[PDB]
Design a protein around this ligand. Structure first.
Ligand code: BCL
Ligand code: BCL
Ligand code: BCL
Ligand code: BCL
Ligand code: BCL
Ligand code: BCL
Ligand code: CLA
Ligand code: CLA
Ligand SMILES: CCCCCCCCCCCCCCCC(=O)OC[C@@H](CO[C@H]1O[C@@H](CO)[C@H](O)[C@@H](O)[C@@H]1O)OC(=O)CCCCCCCCCCCCCCC
Ligand SMILES: CCCCCCCCCCCCCCCC(=O)OC[C@@H](CO[C@H]1O[C@@H](CO)[C@H](O)[C@@H](O)[C@@H]1O)OC(=O)CCCCCCCCCCCCCCC
Ligand code: SF4
Ligand SMILES: [Ca+2]
Ligand SMILES: [Ca+2]
Lengths: 667, 654
């Protein structure tokens, strides 16, 4: 039975094979299918966007009660208020009129989404036939909306990616102009060019439509020759776009933090502090053990509050819970974690293409300064050498400051908070970047600098060591593959050497700076691991450094304070248990025990065969499966990263509890 | 033949003889006496000359109820009766310094085979000796034990002699006559003589007839040392179990329960604080503001023993210590034992051993059936009890339209077992099944070490042998083969053991185990005490344990430093336990070249360092040590933060 048993392990091996999570890969799809897939998802995205609109209705058009508050719509409510579809009004009439508008935009997105899905099926199946005029169209050569195509594109379509830039830019100016008309005609916002009103978003919707159209014609006549090697392969271009989109998303996250709490954005974001929100899963009106409410009601029982019915979600004061910043932290963090994730994948899917060329030898044939200036091994170890040195001199300079501040605050080794770095704060030149600048701001800048250079090491290694490294050229070895776990025990072992594993060590290392953001935007103290504890000098910070605000907690005391509100909620606490349960299970597949599970699975499948035969008359052969290391490090990073930030949501959605009253010394 | 020149294998049984072992054991009991004499000096509350004594330390708290029981230490609140106590502790500390110095001298010469005494000018023989002159001649027919089996009788005799000596010491020096009633310390002298009679009689029966059981254990030092460690660990677990039931018996109240009534000043505890502008002068405080104003500046503040619950904190620190070790020694006994089963399978003495402790598991057929029963029972129990805890958590959080009425509040230990618990409740039914599941879980890693040290039913299928005990894996072949050696199976017993090693910490700190969430301000978390008529209010639930217990940890500037250090140590184990060993080897190469390049350009002289990286087997070693040490550096904080269970339950909030 050895052979049959081996045909199975062979059915689950570390060698190249087809996997369910690689079927929509760029390699097996032509350029007509990428366009078709993007269209079908935007149709689904419109269907999704139309559900975030129906959910926002508080009172239905017929006047009856609607939906309870939910986080999906909350992150978009300040935008629909800004555009006039949604309105913050106590009057039930405004609440009933508003609901009709959201329902109308939801049905509209249902119609347009259905068109994009239809226009995404025919493109995918190359069945792009006009149902009215029997004649079909050509992807390579088409008129592009008839007469409009002839005047601007000389009646021709782009045959190469570098050419598609001009037409794509022209298509963008038709959206910039298209939105500038929707705002003017449907939403009633005329283009007044003053940057304190929503009317400025129509004026710049036309300025941008002019810049892009002019820029889209210059690239039609003069397509850029930069990164020509990308025009040859889809994944090469798709990865540079993803490395670019991630920095774009991080930028969007950073401006939505500065802007959403500007005075001009007060009518939409700060305005929320004066609203009562019934969030789902929040503590409801409790009832007694012997509580039976019959037709007569309130008989032979008792209930909590008595100002609301049994099992009804209780109100929540926006000012107390800090709703404004909670929403501002949920949007800013979303576009930052995603931005970081996009950058990591751009480098991964990019080095995934650098491996394909090194194997085929096209690497030495590239002429772009974007690859040529990076094929020298001496130059690589210099770039990586400086990145590692900078990462070290900055992770040790800022960690020792945080540790020293912690030691001074806890009076360890007879040291008072006076000897700590309370005098160190950002220089005067940078003081404009921060409100009430302090050591909490000097540390955060250096932590992000150290947290970027740390995860950059794993990225420079994907870019430079996809096929070979100075060590494996020394050890005479080839990295044939992007997802190979290790070469075995040899040379003290060589686990985690592929670029997919280096991607994992960028996501795992990126959890620190991805947490220095969560902690810093929630008004937490980052200069000390212990701030505000009932101990020696933790509460002396607000007056030793003269801070205008009072931070919620320090790195360690953050978990205790922020979770007082999590434990009070029956749903925020379910996330705390699920999120922790998912995270530890990563250790089972990330620890070097893949072999043990396999011999264990053998005993599992042997015992089941034994029990089934001794009890029943049938033969139970299930051949218990076990994941491979590369398949383990995959699921391991998804359980680790995916459970780590299932709970970061709880820190941001539990409320914003930074104040404006610095504490006096606990003298 | 895998290398064994590592620094942590220097004192291996292979590198030592029977004479050296005796020397090694003696060279430590002398050190242990030196240690025991420091736990005595530190416990001086007031010096003999009248100068103030030493602030409370945890090393002396776990022995103070014993020295009080023996009369060396007193609980008296008066300095006059507390000034004598100090003199006594000095007497026994100096005494243990003298006896320790003798045992080290009698260990240094034993270790160097130099058994010569200057006064008698004659060198003794290890192979044969009279044993304390005529006494041994009458009992051992003028001869000494020639083997481990023949050493049982003489070794048992020595135990009887030691017991008799302790009894004489209690009667003559400590003044406790042997009265045979089991509510007084005087019964520890009566049974010190009954045991000295049982052992002496038992030590003669084993000298005349040496035991033939486990005959192969005589042949190898590690084979016998491992069976002793599998036995000593179980003994230590039993001592921890017994000390929990006994230390809070009515007869032990004068020593353990009495701690509550005292005021303790532990080092590193909250002290009288001062203002930033504080300028203390000899005579008085000037232009300064100091908190409390009842003690001097920077003076440790008092702590009410009753609020702290020191009688149960000290009981836990001792009970858990002899259990954290008892299970570590059971794991090491199987490890060092399977470490010997690898050698007899490599040099092939296994098929010829007639011992039923090796012959019983000879055939692979039975091995799969034995491991298939440990594995099936662990599944049917770790699931039956986890689904109860999860269901109880769901019912009280009112998730999926359920209430605390639908929970497992009506499930509790059967009437036959109710005597085992002061207050029976689902918290007790779950704990018994969690320990049962937590033992069968880590037993799987132990049955593996015993049966699959060299070859498994899978490796025999894959045509492979496990040549070593500390081989990380066989490469990425067959999808991967990592963590297959018995040293790695030892790690997966220590790592898996952390759950039952935590179900004890939680359950002895008076926490709830029948629900992840107990006592939180949610729908039915606070409705437990009345739905099940609990006579006690458990401190918190499995998850809410971390929030409540840590309110006292954050208030202490030293208990919080442990929290930080303990967490820092633990996550670093991820660096050496993740499959990133190949990545570390490359990275270091860049660091060596980078440092060489920086030194080259920066200084005319070129200096290189060749940065080193640990091996996987050397990684999984430092990994388990960082994971285990980190995980129980902080379990200490749960036990030493106070015992906060109360005997008053909470009514439903409604
Ligand atoms: C998560 C960390 C990495 C990541 C790691 C990986 C890994 C690991 C793999 C891919 C693979 C793929 N990646 Mg990638 N990838 C990320 C971000 C992206 C993004 C993006 C949203 O910006 C896109 C469009 C892509 C695009 C793609 C395709 C080229 C390819 C096959 C997809 C597939 O079949 O999925 C599965 C199809 C489904 C319908 C399942 C649901 C997928 C949803 C739609 C998300 C798509 C992106 C996601 C990471 C795909 C892989 C999921 C696996 C569980 C890892 N990646 C980030 C940066 N990517 C595979 C490949 O061939 O690489 C050369 C591969 O092995
Ligand atoms: C920690 C988990 C395991 C454990 C795992 C290991 C591992 C792993 C190794 C040993 C090894 C040894 N073990 Mg063991 N061992 C444990 C418990 C014990 C106990 C006990 C206190 O009951 C004893 C007496 C021993 C005895 C010994 C020796 C036979 C041998 C060499 C010791 C040495 O040089 O240490 C180092 C000497 C020092 C002076 C350092 C300080 C050591 C102190 C005194 C504690 C001794 C026990 C400790 C586990 C030794 C190893 C420390 C390493 C860092 C792992 N083990 C528990 C059960 N043991 C080695 C061997 O050859 O095994 C075949 C080996 O590779
Ligand atoms: C800002 C928008 C993002 C991005 C967001 C996404 C997301 C998110 C997904 C895709 C999906 C896909 N994208 Mg896209 N897409 C981007 C730019 C590109 C570029 C490029 C050369 O610039 C290319 C070739 C592709 C190609 C593709 C395919 C891998 C896939 C369509 C297959 C499918 O729908 O099933 N994208 C940029 C970087 N695209 C989908 C998919 O199936 O991924 C596996 C998908 O879910
Ligand atoms: C949102 C709409 C989606 C889309 C969804 C559809 C739909 C819907 C249909 C097609 C179909 C067609 N698609 Mg398409 N497709 C898109 C993008 C493109 C692009 C491109 C790279 O810009 C090209 C060259 C094509 C090519 C083609 C035509 C050759 C084909 C013609 C039959 C027909 O009814 O034609 C009329 C169209 C033409 C003769 C081509 C010239 C006009 C433009 C290019 C048509 C697409 C819509 C236009 C861009 C929308 C407005 C954009 C404004 C900026 C707001 N599509 C746009 C972005 N595609 C047909 C099909 O599959 O039938 C089964 C079809 O009915
Ligand atoms: C409670 C008594 C414990 C035990 C507790 C310890 C501890 C604890 C240590 C040793 C130490 C040692 N023990 Mg012992 N020892 C036990 C029984 C034995 C048996 C046996 C056949 O039963 C043997 C051969 C040994 C042998 C040894 C050596 C491995 C070692 C001497 C090194 C040294 O002193 O310097 N022990 C039992 C199981 N022994 C010491 C050592 O160096 O271990 C590495 C040490 O620290
Ligand atoms: C607590 C003391 C320690 C110890 C510490 C010492 C010391 C101290 C000395 C020796 C030395 C000797 N050890 Mg030794 N050794 C121990 C255990 C043993 C055992 C054993 C397996 O029981 C044996 C056979 C030996 C063998 C020997 C003698 C042959 C040798 C003789 C020179 C001398 O001065 O002798 C007098 C002793 C004898 C002639 C042997 C017969 C008497 C017993 C066995 C001696 C040991 C002390 C005795 C057991 C203590 C009281 C036990 C009560 C229960 C309290 N030791 C005991 C348990 N060993 C000597 C040495 O190394 O000199 C450089 C020495 O001075
Ligand atoms: C909750 C976590 C968890 C669970 C259920 C298991 C379970 C198991 N492990 Mg693993 N393991 C874990 C964590 C866990 N481990 C971690 C963190 C590590 C790293 C140290 C390891 C390392 C590891 C090794 C090295 C090996 C295993 C092996 C095994 C199996 C042998 C025990 C057995 O037969 O029955 C035990 C009893 C049960 C499984 C009863 C079921 C318990 C519950 C009901 C399971 C369902 C709950 C689950 C979490 C649901 C997920 C919900 C989702 C939202 C996440 C068993 C399937 C061995 C094996 O044979 O591999 C196949 C083996 O060699 N364990
Ligand atoms: C605090 C934890 C910590 C620290 C300091 C490091 C540091 C390092 N890692 Mg590691 N790593 C960690 C956790 C950590 N890692 C974890 C949890 C994992 C698992 C995901 C990994 C996985 C891992 C891989 C896979 C790789 C490394 C690599 C590296 C090195 C490359 C970065 C560099 O050159 O300078 C970074 C900057 C510094 C080191 C500055 C120093 C920072 C402080 C001051 C260090 C001293 C504090 C320390 C905790 C003191 C201990 C006190 C004691 C009580 C515990 C670097 C030495 C790479 C390498 O080259 O290996 C050699 C590599 O391939 N990391
Ligand atoms: C994967 C690894 C990386 C993870 C991803 C990191 C990307 C995020 C990128 C950092 C940006 C964070 C984003 C949120 C924006 C935000 O916060 O902006 C406002 C402002 C403070 O606002 C107020 O915040 C309150 C909260 O407590 C205060 O109380 C108050 O006093 C203060 O005024 O913050 C800064 O000025 C930003 C500091 C960081 C400074 C950046 C320095 C980096 C620049 C140099 C080079 C770095 C890159 C090196 C190469 C890799
Ligand atoms: C590591 C790998 C595996 C883990 C196992 C190793 C550790 C085991 C170390 C024993 C741990 C015990 C700790 C100290 C003993 C102690 O507690 O004894 C008293 C008593 C309750 O006392 C009071 O405790 C209060 C605290 O809340 C309560 O409120 C109150 O109501 C109650 O009366 O406990 C029992 O009766 C013990 C329960 C467990 C029952 C044992 C069942 C196991 C027996 C069957 C087979 C198991 C083995 C299977 C084979 C491997
Ligand atoms: S345990 Fe995994 S990562 Fe480590 S050497 Fe073996 S196969 Fe490679
Ligand atoms: Ca918060
Ligand atoms: Ca406690």
């Amino acid at each position: 039975d050895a052979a049959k048993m081996r045909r199975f392990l062979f059915q689950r091996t570390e060698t190249r094979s087809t996997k369910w999570y690689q079927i929509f890969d760029t390699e097996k799809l032509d350029d007509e299918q990428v366009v078709g897939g993007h269209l079908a998802l935007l149709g689904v995205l419109g269907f999704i966007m139309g559900i975030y609109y129906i959910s926002g209705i508080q009172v239905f058009p017929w006047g009856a009660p609607g939906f309870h508050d939910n986080w999906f719509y909350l992150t978009i409510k300040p935008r629909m208020v800004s555009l006039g579809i949604d309105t913050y009004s106590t009057k039930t009439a405004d609440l009933e009129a508003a609901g009709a508008r959201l329902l109308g935009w939801a049905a509209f997105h249902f119609l347009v989404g259905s068109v994009l899905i239809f226009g995404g099926w025919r493109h995918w199946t190359h069945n792009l036939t006009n149902p009215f005029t029997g004649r079909c169209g050509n992807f390579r050569d088409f008129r592009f909306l008839g007469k409009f195509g002839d005047v601007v594109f000389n009646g021709t379509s782009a045959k190469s990616y570098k050419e598609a830039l001009g037409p794509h830019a022209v298509y963008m100016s038709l959206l910039f102009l298209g939105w500038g008309i929707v705002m003017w005609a449907i939403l009633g916002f005329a283009p007044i060019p003053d940057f304190q009103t929503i009317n400025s978003e129509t004026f710049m919707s036309f300025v941008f439509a002019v810049i892009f159209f002019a820029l889209g014609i210059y690239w039609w006549n003069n397509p850029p020759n930069a990164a020509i090697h990308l025009n040859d392969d889809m994944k090469a271009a798709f990865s540079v776009h993803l490395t670019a989109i991630g920095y774009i998303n991080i930028a969007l996250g950073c401006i939505a933090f500065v802007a959403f709490q500007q005075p001009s954005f007060a009518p939409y974001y700060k305005e929320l502090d004066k609203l009562v929100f019934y969030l789902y899963g929040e503590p409801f009106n409790r009832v007694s053990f012997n509580f039976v409410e019959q037709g007569g009601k309130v008989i032979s029982g008792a209930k909590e509050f008595a100002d609301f019915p049994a099992y009804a979600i209780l109100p929540k004061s926006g000012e107390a819970f800090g709703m404004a910043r909670v929403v501002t932290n949920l949007i800013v963090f979303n576009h930052i974690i995603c931005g970081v994730l996009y950058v990591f994948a751009g480098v991964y899917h990019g080095g995934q293409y650098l491996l394909k060329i090194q194997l085929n030898g096209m690497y030495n044939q590239i002429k772009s300064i974007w690859i040529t200036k990076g094929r020298d091994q001496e130059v690589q170890v210099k770039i990586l050498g400086t990145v590692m040195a900078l990462c070290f001199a900055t992770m040790l300079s800022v960690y020792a400051v945080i540790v020293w501040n912690t030691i001074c605050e806890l009076n360890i080794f007879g040291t008072n908070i006076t000897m700590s770095f309370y005098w160190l704060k950002p220089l005067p030149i940078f003081q404009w970047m921060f409100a009430d600048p302090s050591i909490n701001d000097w540390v955060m800048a250096h932590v992000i600098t150290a947290g970027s250079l740390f995860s950059l090491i794993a990225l420079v290694r994907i870019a430079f060591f996809a096929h070979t490294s100075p060590l494996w050229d020394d050890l005479g070895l080839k990295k044939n593959s992007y997802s190979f776990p290790c070469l075995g025990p040899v040379y003290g072992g060589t686990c985690g050497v592929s670029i997919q594993d280096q991607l994992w060590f960028a996501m795992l290392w990126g959890i620190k700076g991805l947490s220095a953001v969560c902690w810093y935007i929630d008004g937490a103290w980052i200069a000390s691991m212990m701030y505000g504890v009932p101990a020696a000098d933790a509460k002396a910070w607000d007056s030793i450094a003269h801070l205008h605000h009072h931070y919620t907690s320090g790195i360690f005391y953050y978990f205790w304070t922020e979770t007082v509100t999590i434990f009070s909620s029956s749903h925020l606490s379910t996330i705390l248990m699920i999120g922790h349960l998912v995270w530890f299970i990563s250790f089972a597949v990330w620890f070097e025990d893949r072999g043990s599970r396999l011999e264990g699975a053998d005993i599992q499948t042997r015992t089941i065969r034994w029990l089934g035969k001794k009890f029943l008359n049938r033969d139970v052969n299930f051949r218990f499966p076990v994941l491979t290391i590369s398949d383990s490090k995959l699921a391991g990073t998804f359980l680790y990263f995916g459970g780590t930030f299932m709970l970061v949501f709880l820190f941001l959605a539990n409320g914003f509890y930074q104040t404006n009253s610095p504490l006096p010394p606990p003298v």
